[PDB]
């Protein structure tokens, strides 16, 4: 069986730490419990010249090892050692050093409060003392990087809660999202704006030593150009980031597939699944058997492809948005490596709906037979697969949100109540859909969607504390072009209902460096409110929420605004509640289903079980809720049809 890369065991981990060993401070040691694996294999088997390490013959001292049946290095692939192993090399500016040089130079560039670009199992990392405010602004800087939260290496995970030192220190060792008031040490400029920070370990030999020598917290983030896809190669490293990085620590072991960091919550929750989760299978719900080889190409964003055949399915590692320059090589360079792991051919593709992706136009490449899979229905599709929900369960009522996705007839969704089940997508109500203003520009600048709700929704709107910027402009041109249909489509979007409630308390830039950057930033400040009574409401009206009712009380009720936040998610979580109520019991209907990336919201999810208490709940948790888990939404639905003889 191929397991997932694995972080360092206490074994190696002792024995790099012992002097007089003959691996003794040697990066690159590893074993049969630990180490890299899916990252190294350039095709099957999982043999030594099968892998990266075909390139380093074991000199005779390892090979007694290799042998021996007693030693934890029987078999052992990469095993190797200082003396036929890689080797750890820097580069920087007219210096270059090599072995424990190399290193040293390293660590005394990280002291200086410089910034390294490092080699890791996966692809490269961009350091820096993570309580150097310069050194952060600087990474921020150099990397147009002006506010998305930077992850950290810890160098123990002392001082932690429980359920996070547990799951930082598993084999996978993710990125576990914590309350930044666990981590003073770390400067303002790691997660500014938001609450969470997220936190990891030393898990390959390389980082323990860093941080055994450092002892203080890391920036540890991807080792990408904005953009672009992570470099694999030490070339793309050293172009991709010359800019960036004061130097570099690189080796001369090659990285075959791209595998970034996984994170997690501190929770449980899947976020990001990609290093040490990857490429395990996971078990398709009862009923779902003798499945044919079905290829399901996910979303364009935080993409994942799955490969769903007899009894079980396998997730890509995240693979990004599918847009950037070079993806599509780190894409099809998985793709082929997942097909030779399990020896699967595909014989039909499945892919979103929407006639614009990427990913719709790989798929017409490919020379078999196509489907389509509605984005929300395949949300909660993945939602009801991880809970084990069988091929003839029966129907559940969804509520699916996130930015927007196609749905049918070419609407715009991301913000719907859907009866479903493994074939059928009924769309029942939701949000009302809302202009948005300049089209991919309403996802950059809140304030337009604030407009568009407004112009819909709010007399005398220009009247208000909240809306002062945009009255201030000259915003009838572009309310003339919103009136005239001209790049003003219509969405029933969650994700652009939050950003017009951001806009109007101010809690974000007025242009947004990330997405979903305004939606964090609202949430983040409506975390900090322990509850409040307050009057705000979404009333149903038929089948959709009663937004200028929302308005009048939102905007007419003054409060700190972590209380104006936390009403807001509190009023939109009891307005779907009702709505979802209404649809359900009078459909006999008993299990609810919560899926697209809006319902990674905490707040929200706690405020929808306090008030759907009266029926089974299901939330993602060991998919992610957005994109990343669209792939087997799309799989499910598809083994469904056939299995129903479709
Ligand atoms: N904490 C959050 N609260 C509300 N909305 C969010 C949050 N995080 C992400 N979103 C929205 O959901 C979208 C991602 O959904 P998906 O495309 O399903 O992965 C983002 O672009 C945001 O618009
Ligand atoms: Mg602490
Ligand atoms: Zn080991
Ligand atoms: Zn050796
Ligand atoms: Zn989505």
């Known amino acids: 069986q191929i397991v997932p890369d694995a972080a360092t065991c206490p074994a190696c981990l002792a024995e790099m730490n012992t002097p007089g060993e003959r691996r003794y401070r040697y990066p ?14 350039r095709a099957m088997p999982y043999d030594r010249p099968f892998t990266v390490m075909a390139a380093f013959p074991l000199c005779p001292a390892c090979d007694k090892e290799y042998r021996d049946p007693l030693d934890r290095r029987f078999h052992a692939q990469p095993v190797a050692c200082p003396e036929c192993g890689p080797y750890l090399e820097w580069v920087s500016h007219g210096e270059h050093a090599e072995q424990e040089a190399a290193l040293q130079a390293a660590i005394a560039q990280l002291k200086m409060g410089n910034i390294v670009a490092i080699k890791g199992i996966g692809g490269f990392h961009l350091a820096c003392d993570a309580r150097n405010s310069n050194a952060v602004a600087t990474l921020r800087a150099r990397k147009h990087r002006p506010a998305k939260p930077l992850a950290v290496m810890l160098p123990v995970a002392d001082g932690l809660p429980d359920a996070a030192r547990q799951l930082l220190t598993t084999p996978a060792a993710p990125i576990v999202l914590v309350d930044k008031k666990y981590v003073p040490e770390l400067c303002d400029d790691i997660a500014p704006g938001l609450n969470e920070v997220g936190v990891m370990l030393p898990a390959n030999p390389l980082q323990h030593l860093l941080l055994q020598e450092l ?107 599918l847009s950037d320059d070079g993806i599509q090589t780190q894409w099809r360079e998985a793709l082929r490596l997942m097909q030779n792991i399990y020896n699967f051919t595909p014989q039909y593709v499945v892919h979103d709906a929407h006639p614009g992706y990427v990913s719709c136009q790989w798929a017409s490449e490919m020379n078999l037979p196509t489907q389509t899979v509605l984005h929300h229905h395949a949300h909660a599709a993945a939602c009801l697969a991880e809970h084990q929900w069988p091929l003839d369960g029966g ?38 859909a809302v202009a948005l203003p300049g089209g991919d520009l309403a996802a950059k600048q809140p304030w337009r969607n604030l407009l568009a709700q407004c112009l819909r929704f709010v007399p005398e709107w220009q009247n208000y504390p909240e809306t002062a910027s945009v009255a201030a402009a000259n915003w009838s041109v572009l309310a003339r072009a919103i009136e005239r249909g001209i790049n003003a489509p219509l969405a029933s979007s969650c994700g652009r209902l939050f950003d017009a409630v951001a806009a109007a308390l101010g809690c974000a830039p007025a242009t947004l460096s990330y997405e979903g950057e305004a939606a964090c930033a609202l949430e983040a400040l409506a975390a900090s409110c322990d509850g409040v009574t307050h ?19 939102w905007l007419n009720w003054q409060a700190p605004v972590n209380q104006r936040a936390w009403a807001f998610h509190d009023a939109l979580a009891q307005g779907f509640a009702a709505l979802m109520r209404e649809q359900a019991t009078m459909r006999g209907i008993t299990t609810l289903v919560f899926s697209g990336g809006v319902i990674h ?29 669209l792939s087997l939404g799309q799989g499910v639905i598809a083994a469904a049809r056939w299995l129903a003889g479709e």
């Open 28 to 41: 690159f040691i590893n074993c049969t419990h630990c180490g890299p694996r899916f990252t190294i294999i």
């Open 215 to 321: 002892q203080c917290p890391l920036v540890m983030t991807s080792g990408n150009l904005s953009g672009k896809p992570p470099a694999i190669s030490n070339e793309q490293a050293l172009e991709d980031l010359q800019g960036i990085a004061d130097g570099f620590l690189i080796h001369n072991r090659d990285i075959v597939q791209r595998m970034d960091d996984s994170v997690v919550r501190e929770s449980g929750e899947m976020l990001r699944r990609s290093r040490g989760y990857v490429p395990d299978a996971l078990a398709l719900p009862p009923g779902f058997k003798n499945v044919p080889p079905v290829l399901c190409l996910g979303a364009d964003l935080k993409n994942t492809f799955c490969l769903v055949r007899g009894e079980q399915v396998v997730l890509s590692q995240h693979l990004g948005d």
């Open 395 to 432: 129907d559940v009522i969804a509520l699916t949100l996130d930015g927007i996705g196609m749905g049918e007839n070419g609407a715009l969704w991301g913000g719907e109540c859907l009866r479903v089940n493994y074939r059928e997508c009924e769309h029942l109500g939701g949000l009302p």
């Open 535 to 553: 009057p705000v409401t979404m009333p149903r009206v038929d089948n959709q929420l009663d937004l200028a009712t929302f308005w009048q009380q």
């Open 601 to 629: 919201n905490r707040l929200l999810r706690a405020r929808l079980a306090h008030y759907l208490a009266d029926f089974t709940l299901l939330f993602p948790q060991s998919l992610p809720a957005g994109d990343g888990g």
